Symmetry: T
Subunit: 145 residues, 12 copies
């Protein structure tokens, strides 16, 4: 049983600019936490980040061939824009949970719309890095009850 965590564009910047501005937490820190959590449950977990939509689509297609059972995805800005991503997830038919670090509803009106949310199992937003850890918890329970 395999779980894949996908991080969308710009998330690589976490913790890089003036770690007093938006905090010290990095993408690598998040991935480490998740890997450890998954190891504790004897679940294999892979992670992927890219700024390039095509790479993310290719990565989803590959997940199908690897037997991935569930995707945890923070599509970042692609949530609002990418029908290709939606069609990738639906095309491979791997269930997914959508996660955002920040509360997208508290920001500009264009951020209120998603091409993924309605097909997700569920969505977590605004709880920071712990959102990913919750999604993973849910996923573990669902894969190994």
């Amino acid at each position: 049983s395999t779980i894949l965590v996908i991080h969308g564009p710009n998330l690589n910047l976490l913790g890089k600019r003036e770690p007093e501005v938006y905090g010290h937490l990095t993408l690598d820190n998040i991935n480490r936490q998740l890997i450890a959590q998954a190891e504790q449950a004897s679940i294999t977990l892979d992670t992927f980040q890219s700024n390039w939509e095509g790479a993310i689509v290719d990565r989803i297609h590959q997940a199908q061939t690897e037997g991935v059972k569930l995707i945890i995805i923070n599509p970042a800005a692609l949530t609002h824009t990418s029908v290709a991503l939606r069609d990738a997830l639906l095309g491979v038919a791997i269930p997914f949970i959508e996660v955002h670090l920040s509360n997208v509803h508290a920001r500009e009106a264009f951020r209120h719309h998603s091409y993924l949310s309605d097909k997700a199992i569920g969505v977590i937003c605004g709880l920071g890095a712990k959102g990913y850890s919750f999604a993973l918890d849910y996923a573990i329970e669902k894969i190994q009850p």
Copy 2:
């Protein structure tokens, strides 16, 4: 340190109709799980459910006088309709997390709008009863780091 869990209208019906339809889980089951989780962390947790918007608003006002530090609220249908509830939460200035059992983005278009989400710390939807636990876990960390 006190946490208040508020459940909105119709959530009292959980598990009542044909427990083969939408499942066996009851509101009372959810509350018992949360109370046990909070007790494990030595946090006092209250719960409240009502079908009446006024009762909910009155309960939020009371929370201010009780020193409640965080509200976990499943407003159910009121998320789409109640400005009064938004003004109650902002008026008492108690931070809150919004929770839904089901994925509201997968339903009718009118369910995509919330008078609360933009002012929440964050939102969890579609993860069933575990969403409330995740919220509680976040809240515990935040109140007692």
Copy 3:
């Protein structure tokens, strides 16, 4: 207790506020007519009015426990605003007919939208008090063909 007739807010004013405007007919007159009609068919009929949304939602929940088979509802202003009501009717899964005394389509544009109509069996509007009798006639035929 077989058929339940629900009247929403302000309908208690019928026949009170100048017999000039909308005539001499009262809510109590309507209920009497309906009770007699139901008695003629050996059907038990209960009636309920409230200005309070929560009271109506509670009444609907009670109906499920009483074995009510069909609801005839004039939600009055709540037709345009109450998702809670929709969710109550759907949550107890009692079929309903929506009734309005007046022709809502002939009034302000905000009255053209309903949170109920699309889930009703059907809708009668603009036929005065007879609209409740027609609904009842339909309901009787359906319950006892």
Copy 4:
């Protein structure tokens, strides 16, 4: 005293296609039941169906010269498209009740709009063929109190 019942396009198909899914009831059956109801009250009742809008408009004009006192109209698909029909009914100034077999609010969004309903005495939808009878019962009461 005369009543005219008008049926719009495609209603001639009722009961024709696979009567065991869309039902058995025909347009002629509806007419029979209305005629009988009218004959019981000693009211002359005419009926008309066409798939051509022009024929319907012409029929309405003829109704004016015949002294028709009330029109019961199921415009079917015309309700969403025909201003000409609205203008015919207003031009002759014969009051009308609008009827649909099916619940149009439960169907596609474009079916939610009507060029007639705001000018109708009232509207009945979703109650099957009994909606025409209810309309007729109202009309009889109104013409002969």
Copy 5:
């Protein structure tokens, strides 16, 4: 034959209902006036009215074969609904003037939209029967300068 006047649905009702309500003027009166006005200028003028959109479209096609140089059209309700009419006028490439007796901008908001106006040479509305006369005067001047 040189000029064709087309009247749309319901205009045959002019002057029929309580000639004290909306006046004594008939369609026939208007046609007589326009015929005389055309004769004065040695222009052959034809007229047509119908409640059936197909008959109008056919008439427009016939105009092309008759060498009609300009159409004066009061499409009545069809202005708001008929793309077929728009396409018939464009398809035969005969220039037209749109006329309405009443001020359509003063009525319901749906009457503010036309499938013809943008392709007309011009539009006259709200000037009663004289509007047709004005249109004819323009058309005469244009055809014989």
Copy 6:
């Protein structure tokens, strides 16, 4: 009872002056009511006051006003201005003329606050003038009822 003027305060207005009286000020709902009652007494007009967080209670109070011979309602519906058709239908149903009041400027806030189910049926509206808006409404009402 009979009250010639009824003042109605919608949900959350009971919170006025309660949270950190340095944040949104010291003025309380009770202070507003006392000012209005003194103003009305000065004109020999009977005034009643009502606040609730429950929409049904407000509707019930409006119905009760009819039976008490109330001649004008001064109403701050607060959040219900944007959501309550029931409130509109209560006021229209009893046919008591009303003036709509808001302490804050609603036009300066979120876009959903720009829409009201009441304003178009009000005699008029006062917003953004704080507690004085109620007094002005009351002054207008007094003039209209006793010219």
Copy 7:
């Protein structure tokens, strides 16, 4: 002045920019034709043009004191922007006809909307200068009927 003709901004440019775009016809030519036409009917006709909305509003006020019985107005660009003009015409309660040289429906979408048309007796557009004469003809018949 019994009839007042108002021309809005930019109409002073008619005939100035190239013998060809709107052709050789000038504002002064139009005014001379109208004056001659009105003289033929023994009607006093004044004219006014300005680029300044305030000057037009002022001129409409002055019309009320002069006993003007009808206004013929080409508001030009002000039709789409000026509520003040609407309120001036309604405030003095002088009936008016709206005229445009060009067919405003054939142009950009923002030209489709008028703050005047719905309060005009009627509207003439796209018939060039003759549109003003037609309006004048109508006005003459209406005043000396």
Copy 8:
């Protein structure tokens, strides 16, 4: 009889105006090509054209009684306006392919909406007369694999 080709209003004009500039190809030419194509596959093919919506709706009804298996329809302007047509095709339940000679997406925004396209098997637009042949080829393969 097995396949019915329906052409909507104005399509009879094809090839009639100044063929050397506006196209030589005629509706009759299109029909003759399709008839030959169908004969080659031993499929019986009927054709129909009308400017009258009712004629088309009647024709579609008659198709059901003739055992037509598939309709190829160019509704022309009716595609944007006619619910009646949509309801006729759905009411007889005969699958259809929608064809347009021109590319409708390249024209006015109102031409981007169809009351048929969503219920068609598929749509071909902008390929001229070959679009019909392609539809026919698909239809032949589907009926006789």
Copy 9:
């Protein structure tokens, strides 16, 4: 000099037409009342009315150089159209109260939008001339300790 009262276009017409219909009150009456009220508090009050937006903008600029502390403005029609006015008031940074005699919300939908209201201290509408007095009362309180 301390308080400036600005009246927008058309307000000069108050009391001028058929005083019985819109009443006897004039703009001069209003100005006299307000002058007397200000004199009673020892405040200097100036007044200005114009039909010309540029005059109003110029007036506001002058107010800055005269030390005006507060503007009471009835922009009339300009409220719905004039960004220039908004930018004048903001540019001079003089606080203002917006006043309307009539209830703008009770009128056409375009009157519901303001380019001023959101930057006003507050707004008074529908209370007739007394609205200007109330605004003045508020201003006096605010300016004097």
Copy 10:
């Protein structure tokens, strides 16, 4: 080289998931059929698929330098999102036909809008793999006789 066939994102999944779900046909099968069809007409045909928008844009730029005369494109999800793709096709000025396997009008509303369709020669949707063959057939005719 003379014709280029472009497939957008996720089309590489065709036939891969449970060939009983959405069928056995693969992208390669489609390509083979088209290559054979082009060879029959002595036309060179190239094919290209990618999940990455930038690859597609680069491929289109390359086409210009290879003398490609026509593009047959299935942009898949990119049709709804990619202005870059539109600008590539218009920038190299190679005419194109848009193809879709499925009927996009039968799906979610966001799939009804295209950044390509209005600039395509034409569009084929919902006819499965044969849509590409039809497009190719048209293209051959157009390039050759």
Copy 11:
């Protein structure tokens, strides 16, 4: 004048209010810079500012009679509201460049729309006073290459 610089309403306020707030730069300073820049290229340059729309329309008309070859215009608030200005510039057919000191896209949503931008040669916004110099530079190059 070869080049005319037009400043719209409220731009006379630049540098007047607390030159520490929005800076020390004045309208006169800008005009001086531009006049010097034009003198260096031997181009005659005029400037104009007004708070009155009519004055600006009159000044554009006067520019035509002075042989002005290009206009550089900062319409300020009039860019969102003035069709009269658009029609003045198009009517005299003098090409123009639109300039704004501030970035209008960064402000309220109503500032995102312009009645001039789509007919300008180009637009510069947000570069402060230098935007006028850049426009002038471009204009110089275009007039004297």
Copy 12:
């Protein structure tokens, strides 16, 4: 690199080749001009073009690590579609100026919306290649006053 110039998709096509231009100017010409201009001011300038959004995003991230002080960006089509780009520029917090060669407001309505403009210092459009030079001039002034 002190200043980075970024060019979006399809701009590589400029000039000879022609995106359909009467014009010889290339992307390389533009870059040469800008490099020479920057060298004249002793500023280091880098340039980048790509048809791949991910490449651009990566390049913006790299700019942060290189100490780039200001970005001049012509996002071309991405301006309308890419939230990832907006988030990249905001995430690295490098100020930017948005440039377009053509006047985007003069084109299709979808080109009127930008995900960047509101966060840019400013915008230049429609001034051709000089727009970049202007931006560069501004930037130089700002970085070295």
